[PDB]
Every structure is written in structure tokens, then in C-alpha cells.
Enzyme design. Sequence first.
Site, mmCIF file in Angstrom:
data_model
loop_
_atom_site.group_PDB
_atom_site.id
_atom_site.type_symbol
_atom_site.label_atom_id
_atom_site.label_comp_id
_atom_site.label_asym_id
_atom_site.label_seq_id
_atom_site.Cartn_x
_atom_site.Cartn_y
_atom_site.Cartn_z
ATOM 1 C CD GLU B 70 -0.207 -1.458 3.128
ATOM 2 O OE1 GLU B 70 -0.677 -2.395 2.447
ATOM 3 O OE2 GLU B 70 0.277 -1.611 4.266
ATOM 4 C CE1 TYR B 189 4.100 0.378 10.685
ATOM 5 C CE2 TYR B 189 2.134 0.542 9.341
ATOM 6 C CZ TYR B 189 3.448 0.145 9.489
ATOM 7 O OH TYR B 189 4.089 -0.485 8.467
#
Lengths: 579, 579, 579
Positions: B70, B189
Site C-alpha cells: 500500500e 503507525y
Amino acid sequence: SHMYYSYGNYEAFARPKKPENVENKSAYLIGSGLASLAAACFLIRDGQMEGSKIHILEELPKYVVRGGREMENHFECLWDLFRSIPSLEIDNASVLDEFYWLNKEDPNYSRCRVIEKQGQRLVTDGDFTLTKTAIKEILDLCLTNEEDLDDVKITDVFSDDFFNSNFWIYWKTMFAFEPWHSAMEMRRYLMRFVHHISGLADFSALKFTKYNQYESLVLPMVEYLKSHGVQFEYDVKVEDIKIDVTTSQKIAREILIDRNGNAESIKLTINDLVFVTNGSITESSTYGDNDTPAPPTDELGGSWTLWKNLARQSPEFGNPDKFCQNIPKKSWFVSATSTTNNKEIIDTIESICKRDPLAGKTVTGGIITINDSAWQMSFTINRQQQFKDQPENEISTWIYALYSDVNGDYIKKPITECSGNEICQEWLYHLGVSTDKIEDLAKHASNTIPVYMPYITSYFMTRAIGDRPLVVPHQSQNLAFIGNFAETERDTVFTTEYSVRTAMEAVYQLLNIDRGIPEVINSPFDLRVLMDAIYELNDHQDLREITKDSKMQKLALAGFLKKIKGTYIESLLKEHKLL
Amino acid sequence: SHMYYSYGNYEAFARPKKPENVENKSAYLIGSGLASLAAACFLIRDGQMEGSKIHILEELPKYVVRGGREMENHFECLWDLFRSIPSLEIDNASVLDEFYWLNKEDPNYSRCRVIEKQGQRLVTDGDFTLTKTAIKEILDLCLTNEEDLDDVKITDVFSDDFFNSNFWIYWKTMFAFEPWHSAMEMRRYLMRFVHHISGLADFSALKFTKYNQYESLVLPMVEYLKSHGVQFEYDVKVEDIKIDVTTSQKIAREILIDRNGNAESIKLTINDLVFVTNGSITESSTYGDNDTPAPPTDELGGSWTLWKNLARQSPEFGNPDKFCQNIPKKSWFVSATSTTNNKEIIDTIESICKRDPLAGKTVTGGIITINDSAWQMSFTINRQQQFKDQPENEISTWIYALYSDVNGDYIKKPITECSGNEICQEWLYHLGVSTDKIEDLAKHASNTIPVYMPYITSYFMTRAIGDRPLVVPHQSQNLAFIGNFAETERDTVFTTEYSVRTAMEAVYQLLNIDRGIPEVINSPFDLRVLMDAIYELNDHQDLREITKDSKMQKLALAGFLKKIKGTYIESLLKEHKLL
Amino acid sequence: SHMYYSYGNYEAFARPKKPENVENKSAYLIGSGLASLAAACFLIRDGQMEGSKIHILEELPKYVVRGGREMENHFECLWDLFRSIPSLEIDNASVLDEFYWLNKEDPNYSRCRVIEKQGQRLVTDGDFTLTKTAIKEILDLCLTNEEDLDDVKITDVFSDDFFNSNFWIYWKTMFAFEPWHSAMEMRRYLMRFVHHISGLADFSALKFTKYNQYESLVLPMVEYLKSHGVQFEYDVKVEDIKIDVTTSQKIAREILIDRNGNAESIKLTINDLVFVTNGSITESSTYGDNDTPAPPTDELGGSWTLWKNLARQSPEFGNPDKFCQNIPKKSWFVSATSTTNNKEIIDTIESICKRDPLAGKTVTGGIITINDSAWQMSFTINRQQQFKDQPENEISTWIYALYSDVNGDYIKKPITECSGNEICQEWLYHLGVSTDKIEDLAKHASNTIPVYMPYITSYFMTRAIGDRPLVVPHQSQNLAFIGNFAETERDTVFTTEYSVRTAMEAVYQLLNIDRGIPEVINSPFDLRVLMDAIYELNDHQDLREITKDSKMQKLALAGFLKKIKGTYIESLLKEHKLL
């Protein structure tokens, strides 16, 4: 804002300027439906597009009645369209001219509406018999927002008091509503025809064509379009349309078609407009005859395959599965039309509707509901003859049944398993015809053609916002959606007006035609209309009679009459026979 | 301070001066990974080093999908790199030019995310279903220091409320997180993609290449480097690099390599830069086929042996054993990719993802998570075809499973013991395909290639400070560490950006290139971004709705709205639909 | 939405597609200002319009310093523009390349900022000396909405504590603010440069060109535009542009110009774009010499007449009278520039600024404010020489005075009535030069040229919403407004960035260029930036020192430190030296 709504005589008779860059624009229209042909007529007239640049793509190469085509005066977009369309019956007149003149010389009204116990009229016919709670739920449905009614059934908003009323009997049969249908669509129906509540039971507000809509509406438009050189391509099966969806704009780039069995492609530019009629209610319609039933099916046709192919490309192109899938087996599937010239069948019909079917005028005023029928059978006879070559001594009646998987009264089989005569068998049973001559009158004296439409109830399926695509999707340059499965504001599907309105909005937005689109009539927002609705809903009662039992309303009413005594409000109350 | 971080358009378009003494400097780069090739590109462009002085040392001599690649718009270092790289598909454009143009014409979004009970969509899909305590723990993790999170697992900071939420279902599958992984990396993250919380479930914020990263990123860089005369040495196995660590400085003195089977040495000076990609996630990857499983292994490869040899020389070169050893047997080990052209497998896929896999556009929008699968199987289909010579009628899906040692649903064997068809067997099982045609569709109608990566979860292993070496170690003259196992500030590993950022920092520090390195995006430090995060985390709720139950927050909120009434803060609250 | 804002490296290096229908589009640009030439550069580069279709209409046929042209790194639109513009001084570099390289080798900083009592430095220099109430009012202004600040003066939002602070002394002189100016514009200024509060007094955050903006910015753009074949029409006086305003769209139909004394008209279509720089700050600027004053005037020029003519056609084209009329007589009107090579004048300058003016590097670091001067005189010396043919032994200083109708200290006349020497007389007076050699140094040893700009303070005049037209007005097809008198979002006027940003937005909206326009920097919405601002505003004080006296803040602070103890917030507090 690519369009704006308007009302009144200013924007009605106004002609717009020729929109910019039209002479380099083309139009490809998928299907030859009512919405598709209406869009082509608007492109010719309002868009001033030449006929050679308009293409009609038809799947098909170059007595059945599709009944339930009621019309009313406030079809604003329909009469805007059917004004420049010349008629085919009389000279120097339009389609509206004939319709206006025919509906003023023979007004449509029903002298009988509901019958039961094999022929006898309903004792409470004409009355609505709505309870206080039923009227409350009707008001509550209309006062709820459209956003809050997503995927809401009719049973979820109404109680058992509403369904036992005569109002629901008329409502479920006029519009072929079912208890498992969209509350959004019903709420639109209540608000749209709130000014026709007085003329609801007797059908005094309904208007009808001389013939079926194919020859009264479609054929005049076909002749009009052919006079302007509109290209009609036949044997064209549209598989899918290649759409590139960017973050800024969406363009129809290419259409994959099957031209006479050969798969070939047409290229598209930003100028080449594309009008898609997503979905079809008459698709995959199997037929029967007087001896064999119409075979049931669930095969997705060309219109539904195209919508499924388009929906995969972008989320805001709608969800076709919410309409073409999981349709209940009790829903309306089978319709029959019966043609006969036998005297005693006609005499029985005349004995119920109190009018001569062969007179050439209004016969039944609309439909007749069989309340005792397990099938919820309803039949109508229009102004005979509804066809051109039909003999003068024959009548054509149209029969449909709401419930599908229930055994009938005279025949212990569902409507899906009954042949053409057997549908006519039970129809004669409920007309009061004796159980001795009932058999040979259907098998020999009458010809009945069944038809099985598996998608004749798709437009009323429960939906959310975005299930139907916008007429012109957001950020769309040359793609439009027309027909009964396109989303517009405040309008009711399964009307000729909805197909025409979607056609007008699509043409006006894509071409940037700067003329006011006639809005949906402002009946729900009218003081006078709402007051007449209150009087009619509670069986012709004044405010004193409506609140004669409840103390909370009686106290509030007393204060209300005190504050409006000798005012224009009281004059409004009196002149609407509410006081 | 050999480098400085920067942001904005000033340092973005600015070209630095040619750094001093470069013409007497060389560069030896170990490996031909993404980070290694990025460093060579930066040396050519920003360092202005001639290609003849740059050496790429490759172990290898001169359909499988490595999915989960991604990309998002704020890969600041990646787009800084892939700007001067010319594309190979279209002329007079860069790699960023194609990526920008392709992701604007076909935006990536998923119409379905999680399915369960063999095909049916999750009822609470799209919603996060995060409780108040789960949101509290999310905030607590982000508000804890990175220094205090050393060797801290995910289970140590989260409770059972968090793991039962749909947010964890998306999070554990998008990034292949496991409950026994580093809390430091997860906290990075959360803070990095805090501005993509709105586009988390539907993958609206994700961006994808036309093909795999090998041909979309690696091959354009290879062609770019070969055009500048960059030396590529093959059949070179790097054993260890001799480092002398003094109290003042550390110099790479000599590298021991195995050149085509012959062990020989290259001498180094202070000028000769050395770039090491310590560790590898694709190393020791055994392969399988449609009939035999991929054999499990735990053999340390060339990348891990080099890091172990380097770590013995100096303590601040990192601890390779914290990543390559004691990996849990339940961790993600086996991934499969399945290629088929069979219609009914594709039709089942289209019935779930609501898009045509053969259309050539976005198919699934990303991955699909099987919530009911014991393997925690997740599969994705990108814009077919992802390969060059692949036929147009074939699709390629990528399947990975999080848990490894648990028996599957249809097959009572672990993922490690299942062959290629057997992985495809259970994948078809959860797609809703019947248990009669399930067998022959996998064994004959599809070809599935398993792969066993024993280190595909090493980057998320629990670590302390100093476990990963700095990109340029302290007091280092010509030694740099690049890739996903080098320590940098505020960036997330297992991204293309992290490998490129480490490459850019290593080149800029060693060569003393005086240009601002683009910092990690300031989303966690933005008022607007944090406010949008609060709205999205609690399922689109205003401050009144969030604190509608707790009295302590309700009192505090009332005082807050009183102090900000009619201010720019209230305008910020309203425009972010929080008020 | 014809445009969208963006930030980061993705949209920075991305090139857009060629927009549709451009090859049939032209562009007429009124004026040859900075904004006009920037728009032409964007049309060539981003719009991919050929140069022959772009016309520049210039009024004029084919040492003065326009000082105050400070620049900073976060001029996002300026560096986006001045990237493809090749430089004229060095080869194979851009305008940004030289600016980046020159500002990194010789950083700009001021060793002296404010002087008083004829030469002596301010004792509290460097410090802001902002009281608690002054900081409160600064926060209150920033926290008020822009909509609520319509026609609000500076004195209406600030008290006497703010004006007695050293912060206002720097602020009123850097940006030439006046107490009767727009609070909207000042609030924009505070929020825009909130990240430069640390580098405010010492000018460490300011960046300067090698020469004036005419040769550093305008001339490189002129050479760039001439290389692409951009048509430059001279002796063109634009009277008015015929606009037809319909309810749906607005089109520029025709422009009335005076081509070389002959009045003729150019016809326009929808494709022919028109870019108007409404208003001018340098218009009707009378000049003087060393012996005669610049004659005051109030004659409306070509730019102001065009805006007045355009404003009569439509209400949303802005109100030009709110800027060009009723300008206070105390406002900044007269600016002077003095050139000399005399040693003892330079020696006195070196004795104050602590740097050699003839060294060829940064001289004063910016401006020097005379606090004791009745004129509020402020003078600057840039990196000499600012001109090409200027001798190496001469310096050029720029002098402006804020108050206009007050008598000076050495000369008892207003600045409007003083000749060139007399302005230089009082300037030497405040430099500490004795009152015996003061006269002959100005009259003979120096040459000073006054200039009277009657509209040099128009951009800061008090305005409401809609007083400045939008960059592209609503429903406008081919008309755009560029320059400092066009309304955009969150940007500060009287900067090179504002003119370029308005040029970029106008080109991107009219041509529908689908590329992200770089937004104004997110400094006011950054946690880190706001925390550094709090430390710097109260003279480098921690939270304990800021709230050491107020009990209400002390109690609140104690609770705050308790809730953030051992968190990432406390780490943020410490690393920003606030704790």
C-alpha cells in the site's frame, strides 16, 4: 448548480437560448422506453440538437394491456413535453390538446370501487373508515424526513388499524403497493397526491388517454422524432459502458454494444452525451395464452445487466441488487388481460359498474377491487376500445393480482400456476356469475392472455439513499440516468411524469439549458390543500366533530378558535367546510 | 548536526550544491533491494557522484505477488526520489507522473472490507465499534513516550475491548500486525496515519501502482541507474565488513566478499562509502506449488549473517537476534498467490467486491478480511493485470494468513502443512462457494503458489532503543545502515517510504549534502488533523454525543464550550463537524 | 469545486494533465505587474498554453528602491512558480536555486534593530516586553473569526499596553502597519508568521534577493515569457471590460483599450480568458529629487479607474472605494532612497549595524527603526550593491516614514513638504552625526530621491467581506482578479507570495487544472509551532514563570502538569523549552 426548479407561467412559456457548444455535441440514448424517447424530444426542442446527432439504441429489431397508467393534471413535466408533440388522430393539435379536450367532454369517475361476496358492492364504499390512530400514522409518515426512512417497510410505520381501513384498500390497489414496500416511496405518494384525497375513492381526479400509452404517447413521440431525422439503430444490445472515474470528473469513454449479433464498440468524447435507462420493469416478461400459464422466471435482462456492469465502476451509480434481487414471492407477478364480446359477461359488468362497456366512454372509471379475493384481484375496463383494429363489439379488461403464492377462491391454485382461462375463471366467479356457466364462458367465450413480469414491483422495493443514482451523477460530464430507477427530488416513481421529469432534468443538466425545470406541485406545502386533506381523511368531519371525544384536542381547539375568531383564518376554515 | 529536517516547497524544489571532495569518493552498496537502489539514485542525483564510482553488490547472478504494498500521498521521501526517475511506460514523464495520473483517474476505494459466514458481509462494516475504553487506550498509547515502550507487546497496552472492535480487525490486516508485536512500531503507525483514519475502512486514502513494485518502482530505478553507468557486480556474497572502532571515529576498512565462489577482499578508505541493508524480510523464502506445501525453514541468510558479523564488532550496530530469533510459531509465515481465469470463481469474487475483476480498474479496493477464518485469512485483488505477459482473461489474487499453527475451517491442517490447492480450497470455502464444486476448482481451475517467508514479521518484533542501528551510526565516517531495520525518527517500517527515507538520510549524512531532508508529515501535531481523528474514531459523533453519558466529561465540555463560544475555536469545531 | 488545496511532496512535484479544450483558449492579461507575469508563467507551464495566445497589455511604451520586499521560506506558491524559471546570473540553475544558495552562504540576521536618542541602541532590544494583557489581546485577535472583524481597526482590538511594547515597534515597522488599519489583515499576519516569532526581532527568518525584485524576479520571468513567444502589447490603456452578468454565468465579452492613443476594442469569447490586476499601490507615484519634494497627489490611475468601471457592473466585483478613498493624511505616503559613497556616513552606519556596508554581504539584516523620530522613520540597507551598474564604493539605503503630517525632529516640517536633502538631513540627525557637518553631507555628499505613493497603504485599509473580489468570482467563465486586492483564503497581502498565489489560483480555476494548489502553511494549526510561539511571546519564559503571579492560572497549570506527567505531552513541553 447546473439546474434550478421553478413554477408558474413565466418559466412555463419561456423558451431558453440555444446552449453553448451544442453543434459539436451528440447524444446516444440506450433503449426506446418512454423516458428515452422523452429525452430525445427534449434534446430536439429545448436543446436545439439536430436529429442526425441523436441515436436511439433499441434491443429489438425493426391484445395486451399494460394497465395502471393513471394520469392526473399536475404532471408538470409531462405536459411540458407533450406540448410540442403533434397528435396523430386530429390535425392542428398537440397530444395535450386531445387529452385536455377528451377529459373535459367525458370526465373520469367510478360509480363503483370495491365489490365483495361475489358481486355485491362494499357497504362502506366511498368512506375511508380511517381511525384516529390511522390518521395519526398517516401524518407521522408524512412528517418524517426522507433520510430517516432508509430501508423501511410499510408495515414498520403502520399498524393494524391502517390496514383494516378502506383507505388502504384503495391505496394498495391504485398504485399496486405491498406491505413490504418502500416507506420512502409511499411517503412521496402521500405528499404528491395529497390534493387528490377528495377524488381518491371515486377516481374523479384521474385522467386517461383514448388508447394505451404506446399509441397515445409513445407513437406520437416516435412520429415526432422521425420527422426531425433522429437516428434509430435496431438490434443493438448494450453490454456495458466504459467509465473513467477521476477525482475531478467522470466521462463516458466507450460503449460496448452487440450490433446485430456482432460485438463492436462506439467511441465517445466529452461532447457525446449518453443517456441510460437503468433497469426495466417489463424485462424478462414471459407470456401465456388462454390454455397455458405464463412461465415464471428470474432471468436478469439487458437493462439489469447494464446497470450491474455500470454499478461496478463507481459506488454512486446505485445498487441494482436492491431492486432486481430478493423480490418476495407474494409480490405482484402475474397480470392478465381478457378480451370478449359475449353479451352476458358484458351485462354482468354493466350490472356492477352501472355503465355500458360498449358505449365508447368511461366504463369503470378506473379499477374495481375484489376485497374477498385471496389473490387481491383488481380489474379495470377503460374507454373501449383501447386498440385500433379491435372490433366495436369487443371489450378488453385488465386483471392483476397482488398476492401471488396464495390459492384462489374458486381455483385452489396460485396465480402463478393458473392458465389464461383459469384467471378468467376466478374473475367471473367474483363478478357474481353462477358456478354452472362459469367454465364455458372463460374457456370458449373469452380469450385471456397472462403475462409474468418478475420486476413489476421493483420500483417500490425498499431502498436507501444512493441506491438509485442521481439523474446526472455528481461530477459527471456526459453520463445521465433516466427512467423510474433514477433519483430525483419529491417525485413518485411508476408514473409517466417521473420518466419524463428524469428525461428533462438529464437533458437540462448535461446541456446546461438555462430554463426553469417545473418543480413537483406544491400541494403538501399549501395551506388550502392541507386543510381539504384533513376534512377528507376523517370522512367529511368538521374540527368540532374530529375532536369531539379527545379532551386534550378539545381544549387545544377551543383556544385555537378563540384566537382566530373573526379572522381570515376562520374564513379559510369555513370555506374549506372545516368549521 | 550532519543533517536537518525540513518541510514545505522551499527545501522541496531546492537543489543542493555539489558537496565537497565528492570526486575522490566512491560508494559500495550491499544488496539490490529497494533501499539500496534508492541510495544509489540519491548518490547520482543529489550527491552528483559519477556512476562508475558506485557499485551494487548482488548475491544473485545476472506468478508471485509480494502483496501488501500500500502507498499513500504523504510518502515525502518516496516522491522526492521518484521525481527524477523517468518512467518506462509513457514518455516524457516520471514515475510520480504516472502514479499521480493513474490514481486521479481511478481512485482506490473498497466497496466491501470484511466478510464472514462464508461470503456474507459484516453487518457492522464501515463502523469501528470502538468503545470509550478502547479510544482511551488508543490515546494513551499515542501519548506515551517512545523511550518508555521498550520491549512492550501490543497486548501489554491494549485490553479485550480493543481487540473485539472492528478497528483492530482493519488494523491487524492492513499492516499484518500481531498481538505479540512492538508497541513502539504500532504507536508510530497510529501517529503516522492519524490523518487517514477517515479513509481507513474503505481504503479511500490508499494509492496503488499499475503493477507490482518490482516493475513499477525497482525496474525504473534500475534503468535510471544503468543510464548513468552505475556498476552492478553480481554473484557477490558479502560475509563481513572489517570495522575499526576507535574512541573518535569508525571507518569501514575492508569488505570480505565471495565473488563468483572465490573469496577475495576489497580495500576501503575514508572516502569509500559503504551502505549496508542489514537484515531481509524475503530471505530464506522457500517456495511451493499447487500440489506441495512450501517447506518451513529457519536458516539465517546472507543479510542476517552480515548483520550478526557487524554486530559483534560494535555494540551500537544493533542487535540482529531481537528480530531474526524467537519468532512465534503463530506469526505470519505463509503467503499464497492464486491465478485463475475460471468464470464462476471470478463471478463469486465480483458478487462480493461489487466490481469486475477483468475490467482493468480497481477490483477490491485493497484486501478482504475473513473474520470467521481460523487462519485469519485475508485476500486482495489489485488492478488486473499486475504483470506484463499475463493474459487479459486471468486474475491474480494474493492470500496471506496471520495465525500459522491453527487448523483451518474447511481443512483441518495448519497453513504451514497445506499445499497450494489446499490454501485455495479454504479460500473458495470462505467465498461462499458450495462444498461440492470446491475441490476441482482449486486443483484444476486455479494455480496457487505458496511461499514461506520466515522473516516477514521481523520488522514488527518487540525491540528496545539501540536494537536497530542508526542510519548513520555515531562517529561513523563511511558506514551507513539502510532499509527497514535502520533506526530513524517518527517513521513506520515495512513501507516503501521507510526504505527510501533511510536511503536519503544515509546519503545526505555521509556526503554532507546540505539540503533539507523532508520530515515525516506533521499530522499528529496538527490541530485540524487531530480533530478529524476524534470525530472518526467514535463513529462520527459530535462532542455532545461523545460525552453524553459520562458526567465528568459533560461538566468539562460545558465549561469548554462556554469559553470558546463565538470564537475561531468554535468555527474549527463546526467545520470539522464536531459541533 | 474548481480547485482544491493540498500540501506535501506528492502534489508539489506532480505535473497535471493538459486541461481540456486549451488549444482553443486564449488569455489577455492586463498590466505587467508581478501577479500578471506570474499568471502568464503558470499558463505556459501548468496550462500548457502556447505563448502566441497569451497577451500582456502594458500601459507604458516599450536609483530608486521599492524596499520592504522581505521574503521567507514558506512562500509556497512563490517557490512553486520560481522553479521552472531559469536564472539570468548563473547557468543551469533556477531562480530558487540562486535564492537557496545565496541565503545559505550568507544568512540574514540583524545585529541591531531599534535605535534612539540619536544613535544609541534601545536598552530593551531583542526583548518584546509584552505584558500579560498584551499577550491576551494577541491571542484574542487570533481566536476571533474573520467574519466578525469586518471594518475593524487595529486600535479597536488592542489597548495601550500593546502599543507601548517592543513587539508593536517591530511589527509596525516590518510590515508598515498603522493603528487605523484592517484587523483582518493583521490577524492574517499574526497567524501566517506565528512560526517566525522567534526570528522576528533579529530578522533571522527573513530571506532577501541579491538585487531588487525587478531584476531578481520580474526580469527572469520576462526572459522566460519572451522565450515562449508570449505577446507583449505596449501603449495599451485599459478603460473598462464589458461584462454581461446573467443569473447563471458571467462572461467577459469585450475590452475597451486605448492602443497607442487610438481607442479600439478587442472581442472576447468564453474561451478567451481575462486576468485583471485590480488596483495598484505604485500608481500615481510622483517623484522628487535631492532639492525638491515629491508633489503630493490623489489622482486615480488606470488600475483604480478599471476597478471602478468593473465594480459598477456587478456588486460581487468588490468595492474599490474602500481602499483608494479616504486614506488618512497621517498614513505612510513618502519614501526616500539615498545613495552615497562618502566615508564618514558609511562609517557611522557601520558603527550602528556592526557590519561593513561595502563588504557585499548582509549589511543591516533588514530595517532599523528610529523610535524617537516623530516621523517614525525606518531605514534599511540590503546587500550592496542592489543594482547592476552601481559602483562598488557606493551604498543605497531606503528610508520610509509612517506618520506623514507631523513635524520632524531636526526639521520642523512634515515629510510631505521636505525635499530630498531634508529627508536625508533628519536621517543623518538620528544616526548620531553632529549638527555641524549634518548639512553639507546631505546636500553635497549624498543624493536622495523622494517618492510619494498615495496608495502604498491601500492594501491594509479596513475592509469587509466582499470588498475585495474573489480571485475567480462566483459563476465567472473567463474573468479573474489577481494581485494584492483579490480575496483568497488565509494569505497575507503586500507579499510576493500573495500576488503569485492569486495568479496560480486564477489560472488553475479558469483552466480547470487538476493539480493541488499549495495551501497556506499550517503553522497556526501546528502543536509544535504554537508552543514555540508561547515561549517566545513572553520573553523566553517557562509555564511556571508565565503563571507565577496569577492564582487562577497557577491552579489550572498544576492540574495540567499532573495529568500530563510522564507523557509525550510533557516531552513536547520540555523539548520546546517550556518546562
